Design a protein around this ligand. Structure first.
Ligand SMILES: [Zn+2]
Ligand SMILES: [Zn+2]
Ligand SMILES: [Zn+2]
Ligand SMILES: [Zn+2]
Ligand SMILES: [Zn+2]
Ligand SMILES: [Zn+2]
Ligand SMILES: [Zn+2]
Ligand SMILES: [Zn+2]
Lengths: 154, 322, 76, 76
């Protein structure tokens, strides 16, 4: 109801204006809260594959922020095995009411394109990305073509 | 209506508020105000607006303000809760959470001044209430600041949370009353449904919910861990991670559009109005809706929002500008 | 059934649940009274992690039982 | 008007009382409801103590206004 008032204005804006990298916006008519989208990485070595995301905006919105859940395996040390990217902007202890969702996607895709091991989750991947930049590149080449989704056509 | 009040009996919601002033000691409606005031800062503080008390065995100069419910008629022991922040949305400003124009609007006490539609304010307190994210002060209480990102900008009124309601505010009183005890220096007891604030010796680890009829009721709990009592120790504790400083992220554009005075500045013509009797431009200087129509010919008291001549309903309903 | 739950810095509580009920339900109940996100709740029992989908009957917990709630203080 | 005499430990009493009725009347009535005398019962309202001669008028209390009840303890 309240989030539906919130998000239909935003969904018309973001589809019309277009985020370019963020593509294939699968949003439901009745179910406004779930948004799925296919992010297109441009920096190496994530632009070899493509990653889908499903942002689940909760009942209380926009007071509590949603959880950007990936439905994709990505070789990247912020994001974990299951599907939980670590994002500074989506926080409970620090949050603003007036947050644009594309602003969070600007937070997310810059986070995906430029890997942060300063504030990561996974230990060995953050260890590997800090230590061995080539090997994290080489595994990400092998991983993302195997696991991640295809590159689009446009 | 400029004055809104909360009415217990039988309104249970934000009504219009009929502002009246009385004498301090005798407490009648026989007062001579020197000035008839500018804002809620006059009316909220005891002993600010002062004048001359009429009915003649009474030399108390200072007066007392009280708000009544402006819908159905009342008697003298009715005193409704004055909502000093929340006015009508006359300038037509949006909500900072939600791009929606609704009436009336809350105004937080913050520097740039941030305002809000009503239904969000139920959501903002309860999501903070469920999570526990209020700001507790020693003097004022357990309140919320401005929502956008404004330091030192708490609401100075516990009774405004009565808009949340008898369910939520009572729960707010329990969580608030708990919130004082950690800042004072205590812990809540871990027996199910007891909550005994007890003070044993420093040396004695084993403290017990002891009292008799009330309070104490069968629970010897360890001081450090709060388990059933034992001699040795419990397992180790988790690592802590300090936040310490937190730059609160504010939206630039929405904070412009959520301003009470401007946002986009709709009310422009609110400076000089043609008076009816005279037919002259007169300027509105400051807070007072009550304006004297300042002519040698005329001499007439008329209200700014109404226009018609200054009476006690125009005094009571909307005395000053909001 | 009555169970005690423990925190990092002292404060032990109780909460009214059943064998059948869910940990995501119980974290919602502790979020009701205590004031913590389900995101930042780490329930442990008998050297084992309590899952949101998984339940008290699977982990096998009776009344008069303690839940070790570790806290997330960097939620990010 | 209904008042919630919310004690320190958990349970709270609902009482039908006026502004006109005093604390000595309510100490009679709470003695009627629960069963505790005037001398044991101590009423407090947000810090300031409630006394026998003073009333809900002087302390200034409304319907749905939370008082606290502290108990005196006899014989150690
Ligand atoms: Zn009323
Ligand atoms: Zn007088
Ligand atoms: Zn709003
Ligand atoms: Zn502000
Ligand atoms: Zn007890
Ligand atoms: Zn122990
Ligand atoms: Zn005139
Ligand atoms: Zn009028």
């Amino acid at each position: 109801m309240a989030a539906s008032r919130r998000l239909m204005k935003e969904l018309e804006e973001i589809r019309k204006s277009g985020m370019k990298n963020f593509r294939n916006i699968q949003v439901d008519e009745a179910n406004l809260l779930t948004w799925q989208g296919l992010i297109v990485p441009d920096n190496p070595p994530y632009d070899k594959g493509a990653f889908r995301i499903e942002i689940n905006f909760p009942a209380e919105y926009p007071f509590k922020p949603p959880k950007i859940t990936f439905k994709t395996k990505i070789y990247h040390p912020n994001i974990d095995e299951k599907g939980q990217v670590k994002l500074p902007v989506i926080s409970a202890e620090n949050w603003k009411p007036a947050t644009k969702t594309d602003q969070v996607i600007q937070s997310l895709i810059a986070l995906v394109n430029d890997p942060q091991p300063e504030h990561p989750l996974r230990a060995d991947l953050a260890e590997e990305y800090s230590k061995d930049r080539k090997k994290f590149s080489k595994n990400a080449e092998e991983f993302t073509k195997k696991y991640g989704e295809k590159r689009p056509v446009d | 209506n400029s004055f809104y009040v909360y009415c217990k009996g039988p309104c249970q919601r934000v009504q219009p508020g009929k502002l009246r002033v009385q004498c301090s000691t005798c407490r009648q409606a026989t007062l001579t105000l020197t000035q008839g005031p500018s804002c809620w800062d006059d009316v909220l503080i005891p002993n600010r607006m002062s004048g001359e008390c009429q009915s003649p065995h009474c030399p108390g100069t200072s007066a007392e303000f009280f708000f009544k419910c402006g819908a159905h008629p009342t008697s003298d022991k009715e005193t409704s809760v004055a909502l000093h922040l929340i006015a009508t949305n006359s300038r037509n400003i949006t909500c900072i959470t939600c791009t929606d124009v609704r009436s009336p609007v809350l105004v937080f006490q913050c520097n740039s001044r941030h305002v809000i539609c009503l239904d969000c304010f139920h959501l903002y307190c309860v999501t903070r209430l469920n999570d526990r994210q209020f700001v507790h002060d020693p003097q004022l209480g357990y309140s919320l600041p401005c929502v956008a990102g404004c330091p030192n900008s708490l609401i100075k009124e516990l009774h405004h949370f009565r808009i949340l309601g008898e369910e939520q505010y009572n729960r707010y009183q329990q969580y608030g009353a708990e919130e004082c005890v950690l800042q004072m220096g205590g812990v809540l007891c871990p027996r199910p449904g007891c909550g005994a604030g007890l003070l044993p010796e420093p040396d004695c680890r084993k403290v017990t919910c002891e009292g008799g009829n009330g309070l104490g009721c069968g629970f010897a709990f360890c001081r450090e861990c709060k388990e059933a009592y034992h001699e040795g120790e419990c397992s180790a504790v988790f690592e802590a991670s300090g936040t310490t400083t937190q730059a609160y992220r504010v939206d630039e554009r929405a904070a412009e559009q959520a301003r009470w005075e401007a946002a986009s500045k709709e009310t422009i013509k609110k400076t000089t109005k043609p008076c009816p009797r005279c037919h002259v431009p007169v300027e509105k200087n400051g807070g007072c809706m009550h304006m004297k129509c300042p002519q040698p010919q005329c001499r007439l008291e008329w209200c700014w929002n109404c226009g018609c001549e200054w009476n006690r309903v125009c005094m009571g309903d909307h005395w000053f500008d909001v | 059934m009555q169970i005690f739950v423990k925190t990092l810095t002292g404060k032990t509580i109780t909460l009214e649940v059943e064998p059948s009920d869910t940990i995501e339900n119980v974290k919602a109940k502790i979020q009701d009274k205590e004031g913590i996100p389900p995101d930042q709740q780490r329930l442990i029992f008998a050297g084992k992690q309590l899952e949101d989908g998984r339940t008290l009957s699977d982990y096998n917990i009776q009344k008069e039982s303690t839940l070790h709630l570790v806290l997330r203080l960097r939620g990010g």
